[model samples]
Target chain A: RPQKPFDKFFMDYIGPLPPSQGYLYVLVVVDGMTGFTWLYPTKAPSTSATVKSLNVLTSIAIPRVIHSDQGAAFTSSTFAEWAKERGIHLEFSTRKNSDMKRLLTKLLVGRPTKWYDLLPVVQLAMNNTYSPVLKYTPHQLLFGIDSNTPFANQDTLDLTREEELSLLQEIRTSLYHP
Target chain B: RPQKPFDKFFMDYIGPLPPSQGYLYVLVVVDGMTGFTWLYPTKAPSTSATVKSLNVLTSIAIPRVIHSDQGAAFTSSTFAEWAKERGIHLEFSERKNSDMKRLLTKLLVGRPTKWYDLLPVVQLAMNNTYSPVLKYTPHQLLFGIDSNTPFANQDTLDLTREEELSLLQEIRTSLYH
Candidate 1:
């Protein structure tokens, strides 16, 4: 479950994927509540890269909880220090997303390990699918835009980045307080 | 060139050795003048792991000069500040055309040698040998004598901990001034 917008982020990497042009590792960042996702193709599944990937999240916002498998990237002292600085909770999930992994494999059936390149398609499908927990698409709750055109255009979103932030502040505050 | 005993360290990394065990890189810290070296295994040839490896050296001795390639990791601001704080004079090698590579030699030195595993031998041989300029080996200048032995039997070379400190201070201070 993507739980509580921006409050928790589930991080799982898909594969040493098809080693394309030598970028084999894909760091999959999934927003716990919004189900918005980011895919980063990294060379190694090590500590150095995860920081850059996490830093990218800050340009948008930092999550309150970072859940991941106990990989070296997540367990490193440097990462622990970073999480501590943000007052973020570290949650360890014993296993990664099987459904996401399965979906990724199916899409990449003929393409080899081009998971990082096809990440956008996965993000589109996942964000628009109905979630029983919310009775709405993840995008619907997060963006308030209907699921009619999932990947049609960013132009359809009436809100600007600043508008999105203020609305998020309002939505999360009201939701939690109520 | 022994800018100051352990004050000037030439840092270079080697590998991604077509090895089955997956030790991808080795961080080599060579004493500029003395030819002594320290080797550490790093997972990737990026900036962060190298910094961590260098930090280990700082605990023992802070180099006044650190010569290296102006690679992305070394040239980064974070590394710049770190080298500045230690007063390390940095020397950069030539830049690459991206497709450029440092020369590699395959040494079939036996028993499947990892480069890191051979660092001690390399350091021992380089330092203990005679140098014409110093007129004595680096070990002579460093320890006030010539090749006592190279790991000559778990050999604690009668060099107790106390003498080495005094030796390092004398060797370093004189070289600097």
Candidate 2:
């Protein structure tokens, strides 16, 4: 059987904030296979800032393909140079095609709409939740172990200090290798 | 060709506050055709209160079909009898099916998410905009003339005023007759 081709991903910026607090932009990167998402916050939203944000978040080399809307930031010379240097392909959807950007925007924008005050907690809960398609919690795929949460149950508490240390060691090794 | 069967019209109640104070239920009525809509506001949404609001706004006999999501006021015995007495059908969207209630919720809830303070204006604007499928603005179809607004251009001023007068006449006729 042929393996699924990784041809698409989604990107969008979140907001022009309420009149009081100036606008904040968030760039979201989602892995096609696993629905895993990475978020980066930016003030200016220029192409240079976008490239820098991606580098700071993940060290997994450059993506083979990047998809986004026809925003000026995405089409700028700096972004084009960054992609070309790294051998990454760039793709953009048609204007006002909201369906194409829905999922990424939901993860990046809707979460904040519903849980702005409790963003950190909501983010933690989302990372720990089991993904039906990936068959692993996002935390496990990224960190190779269950994440610690304030609501740890009896099973999590039962881990001895030695076991916890070993688990941490395994995670560190996987992080460097993966 | 088979003609579309007449069905019941349903209304949902979210409040019963006075309109001048900006405290009122947003009334949404959907035609069983092309998913066309009529939205308005009134001082109250009690069973009798809603029927009066509808009678005044629509200027027609009770709708053949009526449906609403399960809200206490909509499902009340008083509301049920009112519908039954008028020979209007009554039904509710399946409980917990948010998608089924998308249009109504979009007008009542979703728009407010993006423009909470301008909700009343948005509702009026939606009613005033031309619906491609319906082939008429909601106000024009129901009241026999387009409703006027500050947004109307100079050329449309005289026509808008005429329509407003016709609308008032229609409302008076419907209430008395």
Q: Model 2, residue B57: what's the lDDT?
A: 31
lDDT of 1 by residue, A16-90 (tens): 667654667668777776565566667888876777556534422346678888888898898888777545678
lDDT tens digits by residue: candidate 2, B1-177: 112212345466544332332435656555553233444444556565565445433221225567777777678887787666534667776332233244334334433333222333333344455555566654444323322222333232212233333433333333212
Looking at candidate 2, what is the lDDT of residue B51? 52
Measured against the true two-chain complex, the DockQ scores of the candidates, in the order shown, are 0.01, 0.01
Native contacts recovered, in order, as a fraction for each?
0.00, 0.00
The model with the greatest lDDT is: 1
lDDT of 2 by residue, A1-178 (tens): 1112223345666553322123256565555543445545455567765765554332222346778878888998878886675446788876322532343243335334432222222233344455554677554544333322222332332223353334333333332122
TM-score of predicted structure 1: 0.40
- Per-residue lDDT of candidate 1, residues B60-130 (tens digit): 34466778877676788878876775456777862321111232223211214444333333334335545
- Top DockQ prediction, candidate number: 1
TM-score of the first chain alone, every candidate: 0.71, 0.58
Clashing pairs in 1: A2-A32, A3-A32, A18-A113, B2-B33
